[PDB]
Symmetry: C2
Amino acid sequence: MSWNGKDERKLSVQERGFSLEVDGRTVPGVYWSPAEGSSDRLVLLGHGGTTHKKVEYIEQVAKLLVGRGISAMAIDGPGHGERTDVVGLDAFPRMWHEGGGTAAVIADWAAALDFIEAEEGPRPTGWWGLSMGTMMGLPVTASDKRIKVALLGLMGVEGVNGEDLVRLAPQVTCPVRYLLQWDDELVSLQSGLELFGKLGTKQKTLHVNPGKHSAVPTWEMFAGTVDYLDQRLK
Amino acid sequence: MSWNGKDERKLSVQERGFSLEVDGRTVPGVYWSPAEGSSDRLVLLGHGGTTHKKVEYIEQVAKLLVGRGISAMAIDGPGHGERTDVVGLDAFPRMWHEGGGTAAVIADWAAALDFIEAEEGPRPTGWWGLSMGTMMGLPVTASDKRIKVALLGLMGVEGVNGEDLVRLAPQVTCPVRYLLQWDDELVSLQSGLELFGKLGTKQKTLHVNPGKHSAVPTWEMFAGTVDYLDQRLK
């Protein structure tokens, strides 16, 4: 576990790269924080299929979070980044399993969060992630009770790690907001509803909007999610 | 159409009763407005089954709206008021049909809105109503294009006027927020989803929370709906 020198001050957003070794895997990461000065909350950002920790909408959300005094951290998921939506690619399943699957994801995010807590201090921590971000985030949230609130979505029980999602959903006990797209071509509305139903928490709310997988309304993806985490994460 | 003298100043909320004669029916109503002083927007409030225009949660929503500078108006629906949830009663269907059904509802609300616009000035106008409030509100919104935004919910296609709802849903073209309860004992989640799907507007969003028909979370029913109408109704 170490900061890897790949840094940049942002405008008011400081970006710092890091890298971890976990169970024989190399885990690259990125940390976003206010340049000036202190930040009392953290959100882990899970990237969407065939993208990576520094893909655009993830950086957009991170910038908005930092604006609310909330730092953000992301790592690359199995077979992505350093190491349309990529959960739709035929080659995606093999990328996921070769990377160590859901257990690897759980370990990698636990090590990343341990790293950040030692370097920056343990803080109230949330999860944000859609599509592959939920393939990762639902297990992480189930496994690591440092996650106090989660924004999840665009995933159901027919996903590549669907069995692990169904198994681990009952163990998500923190508040959740879940997003689905009515006309999602990758994740059927019924499969998304099934997974939402299985979440253990009583403090869960589903928002469904019209359109394709990539067409979450911007006011929902940005203002809506940021406001949800800003209010709920304390 | 006339104010019927049944008035009360509230604290900062002025309540004034009125009464209309429409196609051989007597239509009792209530109007809530800021005591001091001007109010530039209006919301029509539709009551929930086996209640009435002045039932409690309707008055709660009206008080909150007036707080945002938005007046509110309600009339009694067919076979209710002067003229648990009553859509669950076995006697409800007969109450609805004897009252003139959906066509009567449409006429009555059109006359009430005409009355208010003449007395107070035409303003940007929204709809709020759940359960019987959607049995009424979905037709009204489809029929009267003065309705610029609607909060609807807790209703599906198996309701007593389900056929009229399915027929008229495609003609709802304004923005909508729709609420369902996952474990609604009166309205199955699938029947609610079907009706949401049929709404014509692309600017629609469904929020689903856990629990029974009566258990919409208060932060959803109150802050959430009021904020939605306050932002959207312009």
